[PDB]
Write a protein that binds this ligand. Structure first.
Ligand SMILES: CC(=O)SCCNC(=O)CCNC(=O)[C@H](O)C(C)(C)COP(=O)(O)OP(=O)(O)OC[C@H]1O[C@@H](n2cnc3c(N)ncnc32)[C@H](O)[C@@H]1OP(=O)(O)O
Lengths: 39, 188, 149, 312, 49, 417, 62
């Protein structure tokens, strides 16, 4: 269902692109939780 | 005081009196100022405190109207042999617990734990009494004496139906018949 | 048993030394609660577990025999030989009922799906493992010609 | 991106919620991808993950979480060993009709993984649990696996340590011994369970028919029997071993080389049928599907609110 | 990866999973310090002069 | 001993003195806090077992002078933010005693332009007194700042800055920044955090190097420009006694240090300064300009940033202009660097669904904390050139009679009562 | 004083399933040094737990 995107990145930008993609996946996982609301 | 000092001179053995700290410190001061204490007492690891506060807190929940027990024992200071205490407790309980299953173990330093499934009233009372009995025996075997105690029996803050009865014991370390640190204030 | 008491030598103000008596006890539990990496705690061996990791090899008992030890042991030689023979027999008499090897595009940048490890990856991994362990064991089982084990 | 959501506190909070409520793949995915995108994971993160992996009996996921821990140099803390052993104890196993369930479990050696978890906990200095030891023994004697010589030694260590036997452990180990043709050990186990008073086994005490017999070096005689002349006794024992192996060799039809103790022997953990964690159920087969009826849970043409039930 | 895709067909036109619009250059503008310009020229759709 | 964190509230300047001349009302004299050992290293040149560096203190003095003067343009506005800092040094050698500040409205009636002229010794060697009572193997040095007649003085530098004194816009500065730090923290895993050897980078110690070696790329051996990923680590700043840090942000000095550093590296690659392959030749800045375009977000310190430079143009009509910002010296060759740095993640998006507006909320932009240009001179040719142009150096009876009359009356009357 | 009274009141609360509690220690007299007790408690609890989950300071004298 998620639209498949095209990866247009150099041999070098793949590290950062992977980081961003996994961060987006972590946000999609955060959707699991409910609405969000000393030292 | 001179009775103790002269007896030590005649017998080459000095036993400081524990109950009367006034006479004990008087003897120590006299012997230090006379320089005889160095002949009386010639020349990881943790120190045992002088006062120890321990408690047994057990949560008694309901499974089918009959209750199951989750009991824990906690000390206030490190250095007390919880593993030995738990071996002693299990050896005691193996004859008295008729529950389907129960286990006990040392959960961390200065803390131990015991879970038993769905005991009846008589068995629960036979459990707690023996747990406290072994706790007191074990702690006193370290050189302590129960100065005070108290009991409470209250529900849980979160769940009303959960009841917890806590025994809180306070022990005073029976000072040994020897010169000990912290007692050095007595000597000049 | 714990000793209970220890002695410490103290020198008074005048300059004379005597012995105190400190009540002490030893620690019995690890102080693991601190989030510190000492580097001393024992670890669990997991090299024997067979995952779907393509970048690894199917672990075999011959792998656990060839531990860089003194191979010049007759009994170790028969052990290695029998384990290799069993591994080869296991490959040859493998039950290949549901095994399928059809080029699937989805598995380009990955191995056969986790759910399809047995039907698609198992036999290939077993063959590669046999070839690799052969490269390690052949000179042990059939040593070159110059009493024999 | 939403610092409230990108907080280590919030990450751990949602991880705890996922472990508490939902299945194991959720915690696996979240922990792995958070770890990849920064988010230093700690021992309570790994414990939260291991809780659900053990609850659902995922041996492979337990192994991967363990490898992640030694990769990150995070020390286990007794609860980790508890969860590792108990989650290796209740993995999926067994047979449907001619169809092995979790045939992948063989090469993992979750039995050795559990044994090494016990070894490591003891070596590092934690107090192992009687349920850990029981789950290890079930792990050894699980229906698809036959490591009874290993399980006997582990049980002997348990008894010398004065630990309790679990009725589930006794059931699994007795079935394994019977499958492996060990009446001596099975009968001794039954007597031991009857004497120790494990709740399921208190009428299962039976006489010892091997009294005054050796374990390792012959022939058993009733007392009203005499050994034949040795040159003839050798011929008789030669004939008897041949006859026993000839009878053993023939294949039994309408089986699958499966012993009766492992025919119709599907096991899935406790959670699989509308139930949740409990400390005393170390290896708890999912309850029979007959417990709940649809028309008893909700009227016709209405959902019963128990998806997945009634499914093997 | 448009050069060696790990899927049969890169695009599709189902009702909810349409993805041809997301081949537009404007979407790859967000990530330009990482971009591969030849692959962009080859596989981007509404590409300016 | 260290104060590696410094709240923005405190400044490095003492009370300023307005001039009494009617036409010099805008003119103030600034005296800097030399007494405090905290500002002593920042307000005095570093001594090498001298470096001639000025951007460490010139920028700090100008910025804090403008911060002090902010009040006359703040008008009670919520926030005050400085920018467009231009500096041109007339004499690379010599330290500073004081400065003259002339403030105006600039162009807009919502900003405050300043003009700082620094006056002090034009030769630090004369004031230097080496090894005074060394005691320990490392002596503590002291400078004689106010000297009667033993020191020859003159203008050493001229700078100009301007502050905007505006409100706190919620959108560009609260919840977009809130998202950008989170995105940078998530991106933190993409980079390899390996430092670089300072010998080929211009610094002496490995404790004051913030430039990741694995992420330093050069085009045609740096002949067309360069890029480098760096991190102003709190760990690096704490055990480094020169620069400090804020609560979260990184000051302009600790942002421009990385620019100077990457410039030194690119100069080595371009063959503009002699490498170490001994003494180190750290190119020094003569004139530099640094601006921050809107939104005037600060440079976050704990998160990485990517710096980008232009090819060095070696000057044997300046491209910028003759005003403050371009060098006011002529002679030995110089090296020009245009630099821009990005602090943020512009490539992260979260397209939950077309129906909503994912781009208006979860889109963002790699901001430009500091942009600008720098002119550098080789450390060996510091004394080769001389200032080009000439700038001049900025250098009760009736009341007493009335008061004595009043006292006469008072003491005379005191008797009658 | 020759006799001192120490009151330790533990207030237990819980909202939305998170349970908290606050201990208040009070001495009868003033001569006691309570910064030292706070120091000792900090030293003895930094080992047992992180400071993110507990906090002890001095409200006022005694
Ligand atoms: C044939 C039979 O009978 S099988 C019977 C039992 N199995 C079944 O019935 C089928 C069930 N299938 C499944 O559950 C899915 O296929 C599964 C197992 C892949 C779900 O697992 P996932 O949710 O995808 O976990 P994840 O996405 O993190 O993948 C694991 C990766 O995380 C990595 N990882 C690193 N650290 C960690 C960590 N702490 N925790 C988890 N994973 C980690 C692993 O190295 C691994 O690497 P990989 O990507 O190369 O594989």
């Amino acid at each position: 269902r998620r639209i498949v995107k095209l990866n247009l990145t150099s041999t070098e930008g793949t590290q950062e692109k992977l980081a961003a993609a996994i961060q987006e996946h972590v946000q999609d996982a955060y959707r699991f939780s409910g609405p969000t609301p000393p030292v | 005081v001179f009775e103790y000092i002269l007896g030590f001179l005649r017998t080459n053995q000095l036993n400081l009196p524990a109950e009367n700290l006034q006479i004990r410190a008087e003897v120590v001061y006299s012997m230090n100022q006379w320089g005889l204490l160095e002949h009386a007492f010639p020349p990881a690891v943790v120190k045992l405190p002088d006062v120890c506060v321990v408690q047994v807190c057990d949560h008694m929940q309901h499974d089918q109207g009959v209750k199951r027990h989750a009991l824990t024992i906690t000390y206030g200071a490190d250095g007390f042999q919880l593993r030995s205490l738990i071996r002693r407790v299990r050896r005691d309980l193996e004859r008295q617990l008729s529950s389907t299953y129960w286990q006990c173990y040392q959960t961390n330093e200065r803390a131990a734990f015991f879970v038993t499934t769905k005991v009846a009233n008589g068995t629960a009372d036979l459990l707690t009494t023996s747990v406290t009995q072994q706790l007191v025996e074990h702690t006193e075997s370290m050189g302590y004496s129960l100065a005070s105690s108290y009991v409470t029996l209250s529900p849980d803050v979160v769940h009303t139906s959960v009841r917890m009865l806590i025994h809180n014991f306070t022990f005073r370390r029976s000072r040994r018949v020897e010169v000990e640190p912290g007692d050095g204030i007595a000597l000049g | 048993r714990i000793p209970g008491t220890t002695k410490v030598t103290y020198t008074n103000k005048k300059g004379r030394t005597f012995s105190f008596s400190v009540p002490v006890s030893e620690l019995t539990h690890p102080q693991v609660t601190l989030e510190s990496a000492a580097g001393t705690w024992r670890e669990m061996d997991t090299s024997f577990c067979e995952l779907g990791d393509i970048e690894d090899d199917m672990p075999s008992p011959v792998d656990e025999c060839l531990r860089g030890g003194s191979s010049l042991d007759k009994r170790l030689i028969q052990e290695v030989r029998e384990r290799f023979v069993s591994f080869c027999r296991e490959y040859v008499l493998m039950d290949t009922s549901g095994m399928k090897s059809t080029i699937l595009s989805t598995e380009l940048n990955a191995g056969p799906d986790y759910e399809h490890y047995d039907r698609r990856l198992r036999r290939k991994r077993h063959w590669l493992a046999i070839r690799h362990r052969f490269e390690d064991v052949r000179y042990v089982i059939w040593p070159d010609v110059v009493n024999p084990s | 991106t939403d610092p409230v959501r990108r907080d280590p506190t919030e990450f751990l909070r949602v991880l705890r919620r996922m472990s508490r409520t939902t299945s194991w793949q959720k915690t696996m995915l979240f922990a792995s991808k958070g770890r990849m995108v920064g988010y230093r994971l700690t021992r309570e993160h790994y414990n939260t993950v291991l809780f659900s992996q053990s609850l659902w009996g995922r041996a492979l996921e337990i192994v991967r979480v363990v490898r992640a821990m030694q990769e990150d140099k995070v020390q286990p803390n007794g609860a980790t060993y508890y969860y590792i052993v108990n989650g290796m104890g209740n993995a999926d196993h067994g047979w449907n009709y001619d169809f092995r369930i979790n045939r992948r479990l063989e090469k993992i050696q979750h039995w050795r993984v559990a044994l090494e978890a016990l070894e490591a906990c003891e070596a590092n200095g934690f107090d192992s649990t009687d349920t850990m030891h029981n789950s290890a023994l079930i792990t050894l004697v699980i229906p698809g696996f036959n490591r009874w010589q290993q399980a006997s030694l582990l049980l002997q260590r348990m008894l010398r340590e004065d630990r309790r036997m679990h009725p589930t452990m006794v059931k699994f180990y007795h079935d394994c011994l019977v499958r492996n043709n060990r009446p001596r050990e099975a009968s001794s186990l039954m007597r031991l369970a009857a004497e120790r008073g494990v709740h399921g086994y208190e009428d299962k005490w039976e006489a010892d028919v091997y009294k005054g017999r050796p374990l390792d070096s012959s022939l058993m005689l009733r007392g009203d029997q005499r050994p034949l002349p040795e040159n003839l006794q050798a011929l008789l024992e030669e004939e008897t071993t041949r006859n026993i192996e000839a009878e053993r060799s023939v294949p039994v039809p309408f089986s699958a080389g499966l012993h009766a103790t492992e025919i119709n022997s599907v096991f899935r953990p406790r959670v699989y049928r509308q139930l949740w964690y409990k400390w005393q159920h170390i290896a708890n087969r999912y309850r029979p599907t007959a417990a709940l009826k649809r028309r008893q849970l909700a009227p016709r043409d209405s959902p019963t609110g128990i998806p997945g039930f009634y499914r093997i | 990866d448009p050069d060696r895709p790990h899927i049969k067909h890169i695009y599709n036109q189902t009702a909810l999973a349409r993805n041809l619009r997301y081949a537009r250059y404007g979407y790859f503008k967000r990530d330009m310090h990482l971009l591969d310009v030849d692959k962009l020229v080859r596989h981007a759709r509404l590409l300016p002069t | 001993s260290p104060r590696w964190l410094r709240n923005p509230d405190e400044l490095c300047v003492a009370a300023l003195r307005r001039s009494r001349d009617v036409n010099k009302i805008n003119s103030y004299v600034a005296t800097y806090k030399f007494d405090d050992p905290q500002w002593a290293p920042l307000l005095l040149p570093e001594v090498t077992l001298i470096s001639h560096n000025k951007m460490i203190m010139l920028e700090c003095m100008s910025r804090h002078v403008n911060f002090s003067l902010r009040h006359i343009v703040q008008k009670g506005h919520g926030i005050y933010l400085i920018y467009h800092a231009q500096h041109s040094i007339l004499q690379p050698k010599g330290l500073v005693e004081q400065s003259f500040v002339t403030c105006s409205f600039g162009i807009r009636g919502e900003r405050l332009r300043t003009d700082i002229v620094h006056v002090g010794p034009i030769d630090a060697a004369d004031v230097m007194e080496l090894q005074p009572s060394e005691g320990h193997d490392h002596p503590r040095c002291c400078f004689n700042l106010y000297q009667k007649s033993d020191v020859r003085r003159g203008v050493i530098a001229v700078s100009q800055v301007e502050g905007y004194g505006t409100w706190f816009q919620r959108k560009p500065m609260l919840w977009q920044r809130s998202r950008r730090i989170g995105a940078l923290q998530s991106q933190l895993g993409a980079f390899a955090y390996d430092l670089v050897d300072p010998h080929e980078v211009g610094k002496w110690r490995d404790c004051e190097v913030s430039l990741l070696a694995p992420h330093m790329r050069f085009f045609r051996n740096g002949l067309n420009g360069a890029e480098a990923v760096g991190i102003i680590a709190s760990s690096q700043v704490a055990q480094q006694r020169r620069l400090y840090l804020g609560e979260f942000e990184a000051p302009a000095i600790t942002a421009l240090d990385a620019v100077q550093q990457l410039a030194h590296a690119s100069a080595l690659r371009c063959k503009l300064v002699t490498p170490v392959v001994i003494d180190m030749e750290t190119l020094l800045p003569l004139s530099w300009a640094t601006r921050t375009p809107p939104p005037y977000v600060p440079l976050e310190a704990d998160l990485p940033f990517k710096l980008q430079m232009s090819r060095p143009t070696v000057f044997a009509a300046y491209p910028t202009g003759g005003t403050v910002g371009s060098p006011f010296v002529r002679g030995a060759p110089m090296m020009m660097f245009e630099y821009n740095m990005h602090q943020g993640v512009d490539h992260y998006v979260y397209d939950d669904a077309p129906s909503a507006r994912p781009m208006k909320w979860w889109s963002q932009k790699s901001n430009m904390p500091y942009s600008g240009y720098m002119y550098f001179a080789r450390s060996g040719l510091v004394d080769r050139f001389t200032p080009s142009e000439d700038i001049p150096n900025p250098l009760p009876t009736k009341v007493v009679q009335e008061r004595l009359r009043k006292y006469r009356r008072k003491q005379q009357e005191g008797h009658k009562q």
